[PDB]
Amino acid sequence: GMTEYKLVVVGACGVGKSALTIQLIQNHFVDEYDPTIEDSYRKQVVIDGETSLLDILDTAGQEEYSAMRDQYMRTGEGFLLVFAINNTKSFEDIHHYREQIKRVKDSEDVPMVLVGNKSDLPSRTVDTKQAQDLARSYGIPFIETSAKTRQGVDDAFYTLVREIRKHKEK
Ligand SMILES: *CCC(=O)N1CC[C@@H](C2=NC(=O)c3cc(-c4ccc(F)cc4F)ccc3C2)C1
Ligand SMILES: Nc1nc2c(ncn2[C@@H]2O[C@H](COP(=O)(O)OP(=O)(O)O)[C@@H](O)[C@H]2O)c(=O)[nH]1
Ligand SMILES: [Mg+2]
């Protein structure tokens, strides 16, 4: 058979939410994608031998409340918390996005994965160990990605699916 998963990608403007999503759905690096476009994208993949349909909300728009976004967030099964390893502000912004997920879900038990994107860049400002400290504090996995090289992209999304499977067993 197959399982559907409703996934959400959150993070600061410019961290690579769209680039990561397009790497999953189309398998290449799209370096210019309208920063204002918020949409959901469907892709059929196979995860641990099971046909898996991923619906992925690629967040954009504004920081303020959007009704359609909120109603999608409320029913999201798993969230990727994306920062860029060369942007300390995007890392500091993770707390903000995680709080909004907990506020909109009725749960302190929401599948999430912390994603350090742009791992290909030499201009790192956030140490892997700092990200590991934070993911540990949340009790969630940390995955390093490059939407440019596709390094870690399947690991980020498939790890989130594995976290949802574990949550559904409870
Ligand atoms: C380049 C522009 C861009 O990508 N952004 C501008 C606003 C930024 C933004 N990112 C988010 O991830 C986000 C998430 C939420 C939200 C809503 C509901 C919920 F349960 C959790 C959330 F994290 C609201 C606003 C934004 C704004 C991205
Ligand atoms: N070098 C590098 N650039 C990236 C990576 N991911 C995204 N980008 C670039 O970072 C910018 C923002 O990407 P985008 O997907 O629009 O970010 P979003 O605002 O979070 O949707 C664009 O110029 C992308 O080309 C990456 O992993 N490595
Ligand atoms: Mg985008």
Numbering used by the authors: 0 to 169
The authors write:
Due to its frequent mutations in multiple lethal cancers, KRAS is one of the most‐studied anticancer targets nowadays. RAS proteins act as molecular switches alternating between an active, GTP‐bound state and an inactive, GDP‐bound state. For oncogenic RAS mutants, however, the GAP activity is impaired or greatly reduced, resulting in permanent activation, which is the basis of oncogenic RAS signaling.
Analogues were prepared to establish structure‐activity relationships, while molecular dynamics simulations and crystallization of the inhibitor‐KRASG12C complex highlighted an unprecedented binding mode. While a complete loss of activity was observed when the fluorophenol moiety was replaced by a quinolinyl or a difluorophenyl group, conserving the ortho‐fluorine and replacing the hydroxy group by a para‐fluoro substituent or an ortho‐ethyl group allows for the inhibitor to modulate KRASG12C activity in the low micromolar range (5.0 μM and 8.0 μM, respectively). As suggested by MD, the covalent inhibitor does exhibit a different binding mode compared to ARS‐1620. In contrast, the carbonyl oxygen of the covalent warhead is coordinated by Lys16 in a very similar fashion as the respective moiety in ARS‐1620.
